[PDB]
Amino acid sequence: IDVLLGADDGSLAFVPSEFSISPGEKIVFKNNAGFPHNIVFDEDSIPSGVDASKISMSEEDLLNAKGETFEVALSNKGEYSFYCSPHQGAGMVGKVTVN
Numbered sequence: 001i002d003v004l005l006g007a008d009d010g011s012l013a014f015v016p017s018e019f020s021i022s023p024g025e026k027i028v029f030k031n032n033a034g035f036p037h038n039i040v041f042d043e044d045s046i047p048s049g050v051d052a053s054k055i056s057m058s059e060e061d062l063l064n065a066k067g068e069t070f071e072v073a074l075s076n077k078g079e080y081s082f083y084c085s086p087h088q089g090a091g092m093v094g095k096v097t098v099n
């Protein structure tokens with residue numbers, strides 16, 4: 001599943017921002033507009049026992065170039081909340097459910 005980082009109208013949003021996947025299904029987060037961006041899973045809003053570092057950028061890491069991606073497949077079932085650190089208060093957040 002492809003997820004745009006920044007909308008095609010320049011809005012600081014993940015597109016889509018809420019979605020569901022199965023285990024092992026690729027997520028490709030792709031810089032689109034308004035970059036740099038990143039994608040950080042909130043350590044306190046992911047499934048039991050999951051290591052956020054296996055699946056996340058750090059808050060310091062950035063995708064700097066249009067078209068640059070961060071790819072992650074999730075395994076464990078449950079809800080995962082994530083955000084773009086520099087744009088979180090602007091609303092650049094999302095939630096993926098693995099079922």
Ligand SMILES: [Cu+2]
Nearest residue numbers: 037084087092
């Ligand atoms: Cu951002």
